[PDB]
Amino acid sequence: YQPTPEDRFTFGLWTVGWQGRDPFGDATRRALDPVESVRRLAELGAHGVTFHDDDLIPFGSSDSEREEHVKRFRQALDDTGMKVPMATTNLFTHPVFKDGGFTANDRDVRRYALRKTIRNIDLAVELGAETYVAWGGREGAESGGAKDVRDALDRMKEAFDLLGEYVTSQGYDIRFAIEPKPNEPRGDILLPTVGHALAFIERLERPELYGVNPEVGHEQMAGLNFPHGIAQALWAGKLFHIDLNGQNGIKYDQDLRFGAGDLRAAFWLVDLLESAGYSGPRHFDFKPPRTEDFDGVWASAAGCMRNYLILKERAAAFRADPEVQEALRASRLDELARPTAADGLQALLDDRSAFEEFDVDAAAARGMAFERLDQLAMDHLLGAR
Amino acid sequence: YQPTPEDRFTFGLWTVGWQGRDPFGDATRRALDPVESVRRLAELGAHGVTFHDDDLIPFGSSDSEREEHVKRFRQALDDTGMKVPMATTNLFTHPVFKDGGFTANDRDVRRYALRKTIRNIDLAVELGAETYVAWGGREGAESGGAKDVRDALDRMKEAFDLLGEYVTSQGYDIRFAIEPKPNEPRGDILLPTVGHALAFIERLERPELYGVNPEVGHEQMAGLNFPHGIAQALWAGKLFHIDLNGQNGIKYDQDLRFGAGDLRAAFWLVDLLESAGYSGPRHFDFKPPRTEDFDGVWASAAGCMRNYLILKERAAAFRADPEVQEALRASRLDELARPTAADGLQALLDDRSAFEEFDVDAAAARGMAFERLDQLAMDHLLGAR
Amino acid sequence: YQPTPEDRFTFGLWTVGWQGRDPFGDATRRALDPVESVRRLAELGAHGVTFHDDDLIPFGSSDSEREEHVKRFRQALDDTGMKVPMATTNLFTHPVFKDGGFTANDRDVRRYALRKTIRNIDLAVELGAETYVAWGGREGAESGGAKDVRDALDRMKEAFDLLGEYVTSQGYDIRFAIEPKPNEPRGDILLPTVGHALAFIERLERPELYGVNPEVGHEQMAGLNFPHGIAQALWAGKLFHIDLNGQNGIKYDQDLRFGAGDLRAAFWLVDLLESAGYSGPRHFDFKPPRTEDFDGVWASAAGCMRNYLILKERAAAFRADPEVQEALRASRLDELARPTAADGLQALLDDRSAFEEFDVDAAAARGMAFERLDQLAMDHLLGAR
Amino acid sequence: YQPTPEDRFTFGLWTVGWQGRDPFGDATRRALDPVESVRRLAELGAHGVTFHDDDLIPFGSSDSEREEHVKRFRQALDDTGMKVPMATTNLFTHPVFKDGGFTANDRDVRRYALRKTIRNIDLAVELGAETYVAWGGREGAESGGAKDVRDALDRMKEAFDLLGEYVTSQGYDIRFAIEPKPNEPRGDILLPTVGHALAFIERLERPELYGVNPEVGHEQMAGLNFPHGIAQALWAGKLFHIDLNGQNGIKYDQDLRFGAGDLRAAFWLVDLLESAGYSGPRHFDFKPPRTEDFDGVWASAAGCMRNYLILKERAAAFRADPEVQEALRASRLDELARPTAADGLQALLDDRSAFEEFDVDAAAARGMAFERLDQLAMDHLLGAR
Ligand SMILES: [Mg+2]
Ligand SMILES: [Mg+2]
Ligand SMILES: [Mg+2]
Ligand SMILES: [Mg+2]
Ligand SMILES: [Mg+2]
Ligand SMILES: [Mg+2]
Ligand SMILES: [Mg+2]
Ligand SMILES: [Mg+2]
């Protein structure tokens, strides 16, 4: 189960470089030079890295220091063959963003947020990124009167519409992906799930430029089924990027390594991504636990990729098993794929077998055979077939 | 705080008529004749009632018995002045629906589901309903292999598109509202939140015919902020109907009377509905607890309306208080309503006050004054000003 | 992975015999004769069965009918070799129990609850049960004023103290196990977790007669770590019985087959039960999904046992792996088992290496190596070592 | 609703002094001198303050600097009349504690934890504290193999038993209170709820020295009913201290001001504390939101006390209302307080009215009248009677 760059595994600089500071404790690890993270991830078989503007260029840098930080980074990329497929803005750390960026109540902050974002879109295009992620971690409220949500959504649409005008006017080949999260660090965050983000995109001026960047742990913080939400994003044609990690239920955002947390959900997720032919990056947004030293950091990151590749093998064996294909027919998954009424509305209304003569008791007696199918899936996951 | 029909309070027949059967216990109350429910609710000041087909006409009724049940119902409506603004289909109780209606794996069940729905649309139009609700309570799964969600969404779109063709071809003045719910009775239900439903509607053939029917308790079963989701539905122009009740956190669907459960959320909800000028029914989908006899049933229903009217008074006093209007300005809610960049993209790029000369430390030091505002809201809710 | 009675797998009659009635739907399967359930479970390799009084003897049976139902049951046990290790009372289904049994507000109901329980203790002893389970599913409230919890706990202690006096006076060799659950069917249930039950037992007159019967899904309905709670029950010497099943997070009580739901938690649970030498029954309190026919029922029950035996094999391989034993030492699990201060309090106070000369920065720099250990556990679970 | 020191309102130094650093953002407020916090809280009508050792004496202080920090603090207390009723240890911030203090896997860390705690017990007694709180925020795990929970509980008992030996040998008049929390910052924390803590105390060598310090938000992070857990702690005689704040459901620990979050739960909590005659401090463990400047900090703290006093008035009016006292009898709260079987076990067995002649259908038909009672409670809370 050894990864190669063909597998398109990517990591955020902020993931392996997380120093371990949490709401109740100081950092437990020293800071990582971005150049060393690139080389260590290349050694592990990763395909590329991603960054916030403030991960790469420390906040408040002159254009000279900025130039030097980028040149060092590009030289590490050229030395290793690593790519940069995605980039994003930090609109959450600095105190100025304490009430949001695009939806801050203060107008001057909203304008500064847009200028800070545009500057990093230029940098992302230069380094070759195809997707620009927006996570509005501070867009939200702790109390009901602080934020008129209809006005906030107006301001959110205005900001994204302006970004789309910018990339259109410059001729950039880059697309945006909105990353939802239901809460933390705000009490409630705007666009809290995949569904709310998908709905919001359809109200933008150029909806075709925008998709979603769902994260495993974020939908599970609302107790939702992550493979189900990913299917809906694929069904709408909007899965532009994905963030893989692990989460143990409804609580603070844990960002465990992929495969930890809900293991069966990770299996069904890989099954879906591989059978639907998702061809984007397999990006890990995780945090090595602050119990770990740097040896633990790299073991945790290697484990992300290993677990994807074991699950990929097991799901492929599951779908190729003739006994499984036979069980899928026994449960009528084949009938689910067939149109309900390709004969049209009038034919349906005139069909007495659809109502007047339908034997409801005979249909109700047919078992679905779902438990035998699920135990075959369990046996395959566990390598017990 | 006495209700009048001008307040447009409505109840489902299945609410006051719930016999108290739950997953672990037998019924504690006898069944109610729909005609008696109509008269008792009219006496309490309700505006109207709603029904599932199987609430009004017992499943498996001949057209003769069906005719007699409807005539008795209409005579009770004419006797009392009660209206019927909404109707819906029961696609969840009969065993035939154990794997869903519109997205059942069995094709013949999906066809029967559509025929059963269309028959009740005709009845709803006859009784004057303006909204037809669809709650897909059995559309979902307990295990991952049982349901290909992309195929299921294809089948869901096909069913709703067919219903829209039917009402268009008949010339009916009726609109559809999709009611989301994240789980129960299935392990996960398709279109689990307001956001997923809003996103799905935009993929239908005639999106203008469809909106949402959110329920307080359902969004709170995912730990989401219900007033926030309602603002997004209003922002999209899709709040066609609403179900009011109470829920104590993330657990089974409690359907407590409105005002119980999360009291502060109910205050912010009423504040939003009244300030946005929602003019549809205030519908209660609740269950009087099975501890109660029929006297408790009617006290519980009266309490639904009372609590709405107390909250309406307190939110109106809150917004009219000059000290509150002054605090809203202190927190810059007025600036949130103003465009970020009505001067356009180029002017923003050239504005040095938006970036090169923006004083980030001075802006960051400005407090938002949100806690004083929220304590004014608390004082108003509690009648302590 | 074939079960034998040596594995001590047991099932409730109400589990495989669940007819599929849920809060929103009618039954999907016919009722099972208890005698047929016994024979079909014996065929699958189960060790025994358990029952509520009302599962075996239908409520309101004369002593003659009661005698005949028991004789038929005993003949099925003698025919198959199946044992009855546990029994319990139904104090939740009949309407009389709508406000509880032992803590109902009505005194006459509380007295009836105790008489109904005592009658079934006699029957349990006759059939050879060693443990008598009490699940107070109706002890609780939906509203705050309905139940003074201090008075309710007084009444709960009085009821259990009376049961202990009864079994002591009769000379029965039977012990009680309290089964906690946080909610459903009441809004909040008294003694909602393992911890609350363990605390309550220590206030009884004869605490040595009482232990806990934890259920996987119930602690997970509060988002708690089930293996952690089981360790605390074992640490106190109170794990008298256990209910195995599966649950997908914080929501209604799903009662999935064991191994579904949180798979990694099931692995750590089996690891704990086997390494601590738990010798009681492995009891399954699950519900075959109502999508299933009777063939699905038996496949679901067989899957319960299969999944325990696969997990038992993987956890045993994990603990026997020298590379794992070496990693456990690397993470200092051996030091966790050694006393902090066997040298006593005075020696600790005088030990300058414990404070005045303790190198806090050197200790803080030591990584815990927990991620490498957990990936070894993952590899073992998945059969990838 | 103006507070006076007679109301015994206390605040942690770390509450109003929280600088606003969270997992995703830098501090938004400058640090507060503890002496200024004391004077500003005295001005607001608080009774006293509490502290962690590291709040008052910065970590790594020489005995000279330590002496000066304490003298400045004592002079502020003498100047204002403020008391110090409780103190606690910081065993969570420094990196050395990344795997716990009392249950760290490393033995030398566990010894250092005990020495650090004992030093602050001496200081607490000097300043007059009656209660010493222990919150084991780092005692726990993110993965299953990292922590044998039975060994960890052995180590936890050993540490607390040693602290009890220390205070006994010194003749201190101080008691310990264990503060539970289910998760954050560890993935799962040991002793996660009030119940688990109460159970653990009964296994200590001197159980009478130990009680619980429950926090509103912590039990609500497990979706539990906080007034119910407080009743159980009072019933066991173990409510030594209490932490008041607000929390909006199952998510990260919000620490909102008291009265925000679940408002009805706060009403029932105050009703319980006042009717049971709790005489300890009303301590607020809250965080002013990082949106606020220092004016917002003090408004948030004043709001804590105001909201307690409004709720105290409303609950007292509720219990004194004759119409409520009559409704309590209608719901048989009086019968709940009467013994089930003061006539003893034999009399119960011989009582034919308790079983053979009990009219189960007549009892089942009696409504509990709980909804009318709860609407009276709602009317009183809202000031609408
Ligand atoms: Mg995350
Ligand atoms: Mg992410
Ligand atoms: Mg509901
Ligand atoms: Mg509803
Ligand atoms: Mg259960
Ligand atoms: Mg059970
Ligand atoms: Mg807290
Ligand atoms: Mg606290």
Chains that touch A (3 or more CB pairs under 8 A): B, C, D
- CA dist D272 and D226 (Å) reads 11
Is the distance from CB of C49 to CB of C12 less than 8 angstroms?
A: yes
How far apart are alpha carbons B17 and C78 in whole angstroms?
48
Measured between CA atoms, the residue of chain C closest to residue B105 is: C291
Contact yes or no for A284/A243 (Cβ under 8 A): yes
Ligand nearest the Cα atom of residue D219: 7
CA atoms within 13 A on the CB side of A220: 29
Query: In this structure, what DSSP letter does residue A60 have?
Result: S
CA A284 to ligand 2 centroid distance, Å: 8
Contact list in A for residue D94 (CB cut-off 8 A) is 25-26
Contact B270, B9 (CB under 8 A): no
Q: Smallest CA–CA separation between D382 and chain B, in Å?
A: 5
- Cα B98 to Cα A24, B150, B198, C291, distances in angstroms: 48, 20, 26, 6
CA B13 from centroid of its chain's CA atoms? 16
Q: Please, what is the Cα angle at D296 between A146 and A148, to 5 degrees? A: 5
In single-letter form, the type of residue at position D159 comes to A
| Residue entry with tokens 């205005």 | A158
Tell me which DSSP letter residue C172 carries: -
φ, ψ of residue A49 in degrees (nearest 5): -130, 165
Ligand 2: centre distance to CA C48 (Å): 49
Task: Name the residue with tokens 């692995």.
Answer: C267
DSSP letter, residue D222: T
Which residues in B130-222 belong to E strands, given as ranges? 131-134, 140-141, 175-178, 188-189, 210-212
Phi then psi dihedrals of residue B195, to 5 deg: -60, -45
Dist CA B53 CA B133 (whole Å): 12
Contacts of D142 (CB under 8 A, 6+ apart): A254, A256, A289, A291, C370, D186, D187, D188
10 Å CB burial of residue B109 (0-12, 13-18, 19+) is buried
Angle (nearest 5°) at CA A263 between A259 and A269 = 80
The CA distance from A183 to A192, in Å, is 7
Annotated ligand binding at A293? The verdict is no
C140 is written with which tokens?
């609780």
How many CB atoms sit inside 10 A of residue B330's CB?
15
- Hey, are the CB atoms on D369 and B296 less than 8 Å from each other? yes
CA–CA gap between residue B317 and residue D163 (Å, rounded) = 55
Name which of B276, B191, B264, B186 is nearest B230 in CA terms: B276
In angstroms, the separation between the Cα of residue D1 and the nearest Cα of chain B is: 9
The end-to-end CA distance of chain C, in Å, is: 19
CB B50 within 8 A of CB B13: yes
Which tokens belong to D145?
A: 């193999």
Bridge partners (DSSP) listed for residue A88: A52, A133
Token pair recorded at residue A337 = 């794929």
Place of tokens 């240890």: D89
Identify from A336, A343, A374 which residue to disrupt to test chain B contact, counting B C-beta atoms within 10 A and taking the largest count.
Answer: A336
Residue B370 to residue D288, Cβ atoms within 8 A: no
H/E stretch holding A210 reads: strand A210-212
Interface contact A26-D137, CB threshold 8 A: no
Nearest 5 degrees, angle CA C126-CA C130-CA C131? 115
Question: C382: which chain A residues are within 8 Å (Cβ-Cβ)?
Answer: 310, 314, 381-383
- Among D47, D52, D241, D283, which one carries the catalytic annotation? D52
- CB B136, CB B200: distance < 8 Å: no
Nearest Cα neighbor of B26 from C118, C185, C201 is C185
Which tokens in the block code for residue A118? 């545009």
Contact A196 B105 (CB under 8 A): no
Amino acid at D223: G
Q: Tokens 């009769």, residue?
A: C170
d(CA B61, CA B269): 41
Q: Which of D43, D59, D55 is nearest to D127 (CA)?
A: D55
Residues D255-273 as b or e (16 or more Cβ within 10 Å = b) = bbbbbbbbbbbbbbbbbbb
Mutation target among D89, D98, D250, D262 for the A interface, most CBs of A within 10 A? D98
Among residues D96, A10, D243, the alpha carbon closest in space to that of C359 is found at D96
Tokens of D189: 């924390």
CB B127 within 8 A of CB B143: no
User: B294-320 and B322-330 helices cross at what angle (nearest 10)?
Assistant: 70
CA dihedral D11, D12, D13, D16 (to 10 degrees): -60
Rounded to a whole number, what is the largest CA-CA distance in chain D? 80
Q: What share of chain B is helix, strand, coil (3-state, %, to 5)?
A: 50, 10, 40
φ and ψ of B231, to 5 deg? -60, -40
Dig out the tokens for D94 from the structure.
């420094």
CA dihedral angle for residue C15, residue C18, residue C20, residue C23, rounded to 10 degrees: -80
Block residue for tokens 């195809």: A130
- The angle at the Cα of D326, spanning D322 to D331, to the nearest 5 degrees, equals 145
Query: Cβ contacts of residue B249 below 8 Å, gap of 6+?
Result: B220, B223, D220, D223, D249, D250
Backbone angles phi, psi at C338, to 5 degrees: -90, 145
In whole angstroms, what is the distance from residue A354 CA to residue B118 CA?
A: 12
Q: Please report the sign of the dihedral spanned by the C-alpha atoms of residue B66, residue B69, residue B72, residue B75.
A: negative
Contacts of A126 (CB under 8 A, 6+ apart): none
Closest CA to A182 of A228, A146, A140: A140
Helix (H) or strand (E) holding B361: helix B360-365
CB atoms within 10 A of CB C72: 14
Q: Which residues pair with residue B212 across a beta bridge? A: B178, B239
DSSP state for residue D25 in the 8-state scheme = B
**Is the CB of residue C296 less than 8 Å from the CB of residue A370?**
yes
Q: What does the alpha-carbon distance between residue C70 and residue C122 come to, in Å, rounded to a whole number?
A: 13
What residues of chain D lie within 8 A of the CB of B375, using their CB?
Answer: 299, 303, 306
Phi-psi region of A117 (alpha: psi -120 to 50; beta: other; left: phi over 0): alpha
Name the residue facing C371 among A292, A378, A383 (closest C-beta): A292
- Nearest in space to A23 (alpha carbons), one of B275, C101, D24: D24
Q: By the 8 A CB rule, do C244 and C230 touch?
A: no
Tell me how far apart the alpha carbons of residues B152 and B105 are, in angstroms, rounded to a whole number: 8
Contact B335 A107 (CB under 8 A): yes
Contact yes or no for A287/A15 (Cβ under 8 A)? yes
Identify residues after which chain B is interrupted (C–N over 2.5 A). none
Rounded to the nearest whole angstrom, what is the distance from the C-alpha of residue D254 to the centroid of ligand 4?
30
| Secondary structure letter of residue A93 according to DSSP | S
For D212, phi and psi rounded to 5 degrees?
-120, 155
SS3 call for C250: coil
Q: Which are the catalytic amino acids of C?
A: 52, 55
Q: How far apart are CA C259 and CA C311, in angstroms?
A: 9
8 Å CB contact between A61 and A69: yes
Nearest ligand to the C-alpha atom of residue C214: 6
Q: Compute, in degrees rounded to 10, the torsion defined by CA atoms D185, D188, D189, D195.
A: 130
The SS3 call for residue C258 is: strand
SS3 at position C186 = coil
Which residues neighbour C344 within 8 Å (Cβ) at sequence distance 6 or greater?
A: none
Strands annotated E in A54-174 = 86-88, 131-134, 140-141
Task: Report the distance separating Cα C219 and Cα C261, nearest Å.
Answer: 13
Calculate the CA dihedral of residues B328, B333, B338, B340 and round it to 10 degrees.
150
Q: Which residues of A touch C (CB under 8 A)?
A: 1, 28, 220, 223, 249-251, 257, 259-260, 262-264, 288-289, 291-296, 299-300, 303, 306-307, 310, 314, 364-372, 374-375, 378, 381-384
Most B CBs within 10 A among A98, A153, A235, A352, hence the mutation to make, goes to: A235
Instruction: List, in sequence order, the alpha helices (H) in chain D.
Output: 13-16, 34-44, 53-56, 63-80, 107-127, 149-170, 194-201, 216-220, 226-235, 263-275, 294-320, 322-330, 333-336, 344-350, 360-365, 370-381
d(CA D115, CA D108) in angstroms, rounded, equals: 11
Contact A226, A194 (CB under 8 A): no
Both tokens of C219, joined, read 């602690």
Query: Which of B320, B331, B310, B309 is closest to B381 using CA atoms?
Result: B310
> Annotated catalytic residue: which of B52, B241, B283, B380?
B52
What distance lies between CA D382 and its chain's CA centroid?
26
Domain boundaries, chain A: 1-385
Residue type, B184: E
Nearest by CB to residue B23, choosing from C26, C185, C289, is: C185
The structure was resolved to a resolution in Å of 1.9
Report how far Cα A311 is from the mean position of its chain's Cα atoms.
Answer: 18
Cα–Cα distance, B215 to B270 (Å, whole number): 14
- Cross-sheet strand order for the sheet of A86-88: A210-212, A175-178, A131-134, A86-88, A48-52, A9-12, A282-284, A243-244
Cα C208 from Cα C60, distance rounded (Å)? 34
**Ramachandran region of residue B262, left (φ > 0), alpha (ψ -120 to 50) or beta?**
beta
Phi-psi region of C249 (alpha: psi -120 to 50; beta: other; left: phi over 0): left
Size of interface B-D (CB pairs under 8 A): 116
Asked whether the beta carbons of B139 and B189 are under 8 A apart, the reply is yes
Beta strands in chain C (DSSP E): 9-12, 48-52, 86-88, 131-134, 140-141, 175-178, 188-189, 210-212, 243-244, 282-284
Q: Please, what is the Cα angle at B229 between B227 and B234, to 5 degrees?
A: 90
> What are the strands, taking DSSP E only, across B193-310?
210-212, 243-244, 282-284
Which of C92-95's residues contact partners 24+ apart within 8 Å by CB, and which partners? C92/B24, C92/B25, C92/C135, C92/C137, C92/C138, C92/C185, C93/B24, C93/B25, C93/B26, C93/C54, C93/C59, C94/B25, C94/B26, C94/C59, C94/D360, C94/D364, C95/B20, C95/B25, C95/B26, C95/B27, C95/B28, C95/B290, C95/D364, C95/D365
C-alpha closest to that of D223 among B252, B250, B184, A248: B250
Which phi and psi angles does B339 have, rounded to 5°?
-60, 140
Identified catalytic residue from D55, D99, D262, D271 = D55
Of the candidates D299, D285, D288, the one whose C-alpha atom is nearest the C-alpha of residue D10 is D285
Contact C33, C41 (CB under 8 A): no
Nearby residues of D95 by Cβ (< 8 Å), 6 or more positions away: A20, A25, A26, A27, A28, A290, C364, C365
Give the whole-angstrom CA distance, residue B197 versus residue B181: 10
- DSSP character for C33? P
Whether residue A184 and residue D252 make contact (CB cut-off 8 A), yes or no, is: yes
Residues of chain D with C-beta less than 8 angstroms from the C-beta of B251? 223
Helix axes A34-44, A63-80, angle to 10 degrees: 20
Asked if B365 contacts D293 with a C-beta cutoff of 8 angstroms, the reply is: yes
Active site includes B295? no
Cα–Cα distance, A205 to D32 (Å, whole number):
48
* Two tokens, residue B235: 């922002």
User: CA-CA distance, B356 to A119, in Å (whole number)?
Assistant: 12
Long-range contacts of residues C342-347, Cβ cutoff 8 Å, at least 24 apart = C345/D162, C345/D165, C345/D166, C345/D169
- Residues near C112 by beta carbon (within 8 Å), at least 6 away in sequence: C96, D354, D355, D358, D360, D363
Task: Give chain A's contact residues with D (Cβ, < 8 Å).
Answer: 20-28, 92-95, 97-99, 137-138, 142-143, 146, 183-185, 187-188, 221, 248, 250-254, 256, 260, 289-291
Q: Nearest CA to D132 among D78, D85, D83?
A: D85
User: Which residues of chain B have a CB within 8 Å of the CB of A188?
Assistant: 224-225, 228
For C297, the closest chain A residue by CA position comes to A371
Cα separation, A65 vs A63, whole angstroms: 6
Does the domain at residues B1-385 carry the CATH identifier 3.30.360.10? no
B229 contacts A335? CB cut-off 8 A = no
B370: left (phi over 0), alpha (psi -120 to 50) or beta: alpha
Name the amino acid, one letter, at C64: S
Q: Cα–Cα distances in Å, from A153 out to A157, A211, A351, C280, D34?
A: 6, 17, 47, 58, 42
Of A94, A248, A256, which has the smallest distance from its Cβ to D26's Cβ? Answer: A94
Angle at A366 between CA A360 and CA A368, to 5 degrees: 125
DSSP state of D246: B
Phi-psi region of B242 (alpha: psi -120 to 50; beta: other; left: phi over 0): beta
- CB proximity list for C51: less than 8 A, separation 6 or greater: C12, C13, C14, C34, C84, C87, C88
Cβ within 8 Å, pair C253-B254: no
Q: Can you give the length of chain A in residues? A: 385
B249: DSSP letter: S
Does the annotation place C271 within a ligand binding site? no
